Design an enzyme around this catalytic site. Structure first.
Site, PDB file in Angstrom:
ATOM      1  CG  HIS A  30      37.433   7.336  15.007  1.00 15.71           C
ATOM      2  ND1 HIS A  30      38.807   7.286  15.138  1.00 15.71           N
ATOM      3  CD2 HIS A  30      36.936   6.951  16.209  1.00 15.71           C
ATOM      4  CE1 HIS A  30      39.127   6.884  16.357  1.00 15.71           C
ATOM      5  NE2 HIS A  30      38.008   6.670  17.027  1.00 15.71           N
ATOM      6  CG  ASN A  77      26.740   7.156  22.859  1.00 14.49           C
ATOM      7  OD1 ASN A  77      26.290   7.193  24.004  1.00 14.49           O
ATOM      8  ND2 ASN A  77      28.016   6.972  22.620  1.00 14.49           N
ATOM      9  CG  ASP A  98      41.874   7.926  14.112  1.00 12.52           C
ATOM     10  OD1 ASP A  98      41.927   7.206  15.125  1.00 12.52           O
ATOM     11  OD2 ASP A  98      40.831   8.140  13.479  1.00 12.52           O
ATOM     12  CG  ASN A 158      32.947   6.104  19.271  1.00  9.90           C
ATOM     13  OD1 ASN A 158      32.825   5.449  18.253  1.00  9.90           O
ATOM     14  ND2 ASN A 158      34.085   6.638  19.623  1.00  9.90           N
ATOM     15  CB  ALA A 184      30.355  16.348  34.120  1.00  6.49           C
ATOM     16  N   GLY A 185      32.214  14.492  31.855  1.00 12.38           N
ATOM     17  CA  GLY A 185      32.824  13.199  31.599  1.00 12.38           C
ATOM     18  C   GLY A 185      34.344  13.178  31.571  1.00 12.38           C
ATOM     19  N   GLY A 186      34.907  12.019  31.264  1.00  7.47           N
ATOM     20  CA  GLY A 186      36.355  11.874  31.304  1.00  7.47           C
ATOM     21  C   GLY A 186      37.031  12.698  30.241  1.00  7.47           C
ATOM     22  CB  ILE A 187      36.258  13.073  26.615  1.00  9.58           C
ATOM     23  CG1 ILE A 187      36.635  11.642  26.285  1.00  9.58           C
ATOM     24  CG2 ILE A 187      36.662  14.031  25.472  1.00  9.58           C
ATOM     25  CD1 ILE A 187      35.921  11.128  25.092  1.00  9.58           C
TER      26      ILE A 187
HETATM   27  N1  NAD Z   1      35.346   9.520  17.473  1.00  8.56           N
HETATM   28  C1  NAD Z   1      36.283   9.799  18.339  1.00  8.56           C
HETATM   29  O1  NAD Z   1      37.476   9.905  18.061  1.00  8.56           O
HETATM   30  C2  NAD Z   1      35.764  10.063  19.727  1.00  8.56           C
HETATM   31  C3  NAD Z   1      36.563  10.818  20.525  1.00  8.56           C
HETATM   32  C4  NAD Z   1      36.179  11.033  21.836  1.00  8.56           C
HETATM   33  C5  NAD Z   1      34.975  10.537  22.327  1.00  8.56           C
HETATM   34  N2  NAD Z   1      34.148   9.781  21.535  1.00  8.56           N
HETATM   35  C6  NAD Z   1      32.943   9.280  22.206  1.00  8.56           C
HETATM   36  O2  NAD Z   1      32.504  10.304  23.140  1.00  8.56           O
HETATM   37  C7  NAD Z   1      31.832   9.654  24.246  1.00  8.56           C
HETATM   38  C8  NAD Z   1      32.763   9.947  25.417  1.00  8.56           C
HETATM   39  O3  NAD Z   1      32.684   9.188  26.631  1.00  8.56           O
HETATM   40  P1  NAD Z   1      33.712   9.508  27.865  1.00  8.56           P
HETATM   41  O4  NAD Z   1      34.947   8.692  27.725  1.00  8.56           O
HETATM   42  O5  NAD Z   1      33.957  10.925  28.230  1.00  8.56           O
HETATM   43  O6  NAD Z   1      32.729   8.835  28.917  1.00  8.56           O
HETATM   44  P2  NAD Z   1      32.193   9.476  30.265  1.00  8.56           P
HETATM   45  O7  NAD Z   1      31.138   8.502  30.638  1.00  8.56           O
HETATM   46  O8  NAD Z   1      33.347   9.691  31.146  1.00  8.56           O
HETATM   47  O9  NAD Z   1      31.622  10.923  29.734  1.00  8.56           O
HETATM   48  C9  NAD Z   1      30.358  11.155  29.041  1.00  8.56           C
HETATM   49  C10 NAD Z   1      29.516  12.327  29.584  1.00  8.56           C
HETATM   50  O10 NAD Z   1      28.283  12.389  28.842  1.00  8.56           O
HETATM   51  C11 NAD Z   1      27.389  12.980  29.786  1.00  8.56           C
HETATM   52  N3  NAD Z   1      26.005  13.035  29.310  1.00  8.56           N
HETATM   53  C12 NAD Z   1      25.211  12.057  28.819  1.00  8.56           C
HETATM   54  N4  NAD Z   1      24.181  12.580  28.133  1.00  8.56           N
HETATM   55  C13 NAD Z   1      24.385  13.894  28.225  1.00  8.56           C
HETATM   56  C14 NAD Z   1      23.719  14.872  27.511  1.00  8.56           C
HETATM   57  N5  NAD Z   1      22.533  14.736  26.964  1.00  8.56           N
HETATM   58  N6  NAD Z   1      24.243  16.097  27.597  1.00  8.56           N
HETATM   59  C15 NAD Z   1      25.302  16.361  28.352  1.00  8.56           C
HETATM   60  N7  NAD Z   1      25.932  15.456  29.078  1.00  8.56           N
HETATM   61  C16 NAD Z   1      25.493  14.199  28.980  1.00  8.56           C
HETATM   62  C17 NAD Z   1      27.559  12.176  31.048  1.00  8.56           C
HETATM   63  O11 NAD Z   1      26.931  12.663  32.258  1.00  8.56           O
HETATM   64  C18 NAD Z   1      29.079  12.153  31.052  1.00  8.56           C
HETATM   65  O12 NAD Z   1      29.589  13.144  31.949  1.00  8.56           O
HETATM   66  C19 NAD Z   1      31.775   8.186  23.818  1.00  8.56           C
HETATM   67  O13 NAD Z   1      30.725   7.888  22.881  1.00  8.56           O
HETATM   68  C20 NAD Z   1      33.106   8.026  23.085  1.00  8.56           C
HETATM   69  O14 NAD Z   1      33.215   6.707  22.479  1.00  8.56           O
HETATM   70  C21 NAD Z   1      34.590   9.499  20.221  1.00  8.56           C
END
Ligand code: NAD
Ligand code: NAD
Lengths: 312, 312
Positions: free
Chosen positions: B177, B94, B150, B119, B9-12
């Protein structure tokens, strides 16, 4: 081509943005506009994808920068409805937004092809047309109510019923974009036949599909990802036709000859100047004839509401 | 294949979802899980797109339903950083999320290929590996830190510098990363040459690209749409290899021979069982050798932080 997306930071705008960035022809430009201050950062995010499409994002009250030299404008700004609401209930928040953005389009890029996605489409397209008329700049071949989501919804629902490959079925949809005015022409789907019980049931599922998603999201909004997909299909069809490609046809809500209402969605041959020809809706079944006759007074009340807002 | 997205459901998660729905092979299944209650409605939204990919969405505290029979699991749940933060600053929110979700994976689908996107990846992948070890179920060929963003960032930045078509340039990226551990191997980009000033400048732009988007969004989050794109590329590579396609190679952060650190990102030949062979990083320039030597103590502190959390 330059394509401008007004309302780029919303749920629809970001999905549309993602798809256009990855699918527009090499050499295209994409500009994003929204009042939301995150918008320039949405463009930076997208600019890291390796495709030959230049992208810039703009924020604030003035959309001129985004609109300069635009060939296609796609408007998806406005509020989503909540469970228990109709699309027409959105008139009070969204009519002003659309009026505001089309005046900016009328000043800056009056020759662009304009796609209105903002709800309620049956009414907001009429708002747009009246604004462009008052500005001395209306071209009825270049104003579109985007109904493509009804099409791809019907394709999906038919294929699963009839055991077809989803990408292989195309169904014509005429009328408008509300629960009463969406009419899928199921009698004209090549290679498939339906019982009258299948026609009633499918037509209902198709007309109520927007409320199905609103109910399912539980106050978290309406259809965003599928609508992004639908609008990207329409936009890419517009771009293809404008670049001279032959035989591109899409159903869209458009001012036509008025045989049914002022604005009416029907199949359209797209060319270098917008709509090339407005195609015949063909031969209707008895169900379809009846459904059409029954929708017509609701449709033209939708229209007159839009014209009223601008003209009084 | 069945592909599960935890954090849908998040942005990613939503951008990833959109792309996998439209690009996974015919006959695929996609399940979405998030604690957020909008999640089943995200799946309904997507289910209206006409492709032969079955999609279901799940909410609540238990991910088992989403995980049953999964071949690939993609984890993108967790908090984004704000301006002025480092990726490592995200550890406290996280680490628990990732521990929780991988225990569920360890019970339900221990043979799936698992991609960690959450992350800070350098640390969270080590959390994952320790959880899977404690469950008696660790396979080092099936655990991946997703670094694909990257790569596609470097492809974009190189092509624009060197006047190449963006889709035609591929650059190897090794290390990890984080700002200090992202090492683009610019000496190995076929058909392009760089001055040492171009190498310094490009390497910096590439290492700081995540902070560039965070700054640009102004508290509205980090990279979502480009990261969706990157993760969809990796996922489709995993799926392709698992279905028996030959010569699919991707860089990813993976437990290897330990010549540099326990976990290290390098080019990998993917097969039917996860990583088929861990390829040589090749011959390094003097800049690249130096950059590598300088990153190594920061990398293994990242790792030890992850193992600590699980093992104490
Ligand atoms: N290493 C990389 O290249 C890489 C790439 C993408 C994302 N990430 C990390 O992934 C995370 C992505 O955040 P985003 O931008 O989508 O933010 P966001 O806040 O839009 O999305 C995060 C989602 O996590 C959900 N959530 C939290 N705990 C949960 C769980 N136990 N199970 C299921 N859903 C749960 C939230 O409800 C939310 O919908 C961050 O830590 C980001 O830094 C790292
Ligand atoms: N007829 C159709 O088939 C159709 C299709 C898609 C969308 N729509 C309509 O489009 C709107 C889409 O909402 P959504 O789901 O993306 O909701 P959303 O709330 O996620 O997005 C709407 C965006 O409008 C922006 N905004 C408001 N006024 C603005 C303005 N003057 N200029 C630029 N940005 C502005 C907001 O900041 C927001 O980012 C609704 O009215 C929806 O019902 C209709």
């Amino acid at each position: 081509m330059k394509v401008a997306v007004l309302g780029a930071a919303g749920g629809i705008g970001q999905a549309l943005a993602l798809l256009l960035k990855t699918q527009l022809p090499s050499g295209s430009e994409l500009s994003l506009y929204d009042i939301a201050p995150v918008t320039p950062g949405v463009a930076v995010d997208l600019s890291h994808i390796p495709t030959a499409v230049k992208i810039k994002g703009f924020s604030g009250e003035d959309a001129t920068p985004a609109l300069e030299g635009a060939d296609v404008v796609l408007i998806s700004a406005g509020v989503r409805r909540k469970p228990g609401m109709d699309r027409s209930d959105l008139f009070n928040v969204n009519a002003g937004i659309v009026k505001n953005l089309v005046q900016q389009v009328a000043k800056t890029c009056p020759k662009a092809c304009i796609g209105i996605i903002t709800n309620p489409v049956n009414t907001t397209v009429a708002i747009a047309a009246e604004v462009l008329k008052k500005a001395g700049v209306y071209d009825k071949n270049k104003l579109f109510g985007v109904t493509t989501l009804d099409i791809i919804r019907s394709n999906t629902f038919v294929a699963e019923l009839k055991g077809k490959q989803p990408g292989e079925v195309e169904v014509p949809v005429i009328g408008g974009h509300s629960g009463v005015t969406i009419l899928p022409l199921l009698s004209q789907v090549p290679g498939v036949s339906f019982t009258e019980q299948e026609v009633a049931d499918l037509t209902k599922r198709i007309q109520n599909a927007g409320t199905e998603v609103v109910e399912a999201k539980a106050g978290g909004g309406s259809a965003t990802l599928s609508m992004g997909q639908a609008a990207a299909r329409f936009g890419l069809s517009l771009v293809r036709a404008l670049q001279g490609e032959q035989g591109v046809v899409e159903c869209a809500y458009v001012e036509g000859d008025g045989q049914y209402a002022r604005f009416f969605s029907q199949p359209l041959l797209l060319g270098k100047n917008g709509v090339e020809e407005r195609k015949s809706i063909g031969t209707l079944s008895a169900f379809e004839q009846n459904a059409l006759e029954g929708m017509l007074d609701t449709l033209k009340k939708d229209i007159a509401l839009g014209q009223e807002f601008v003209n009084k």
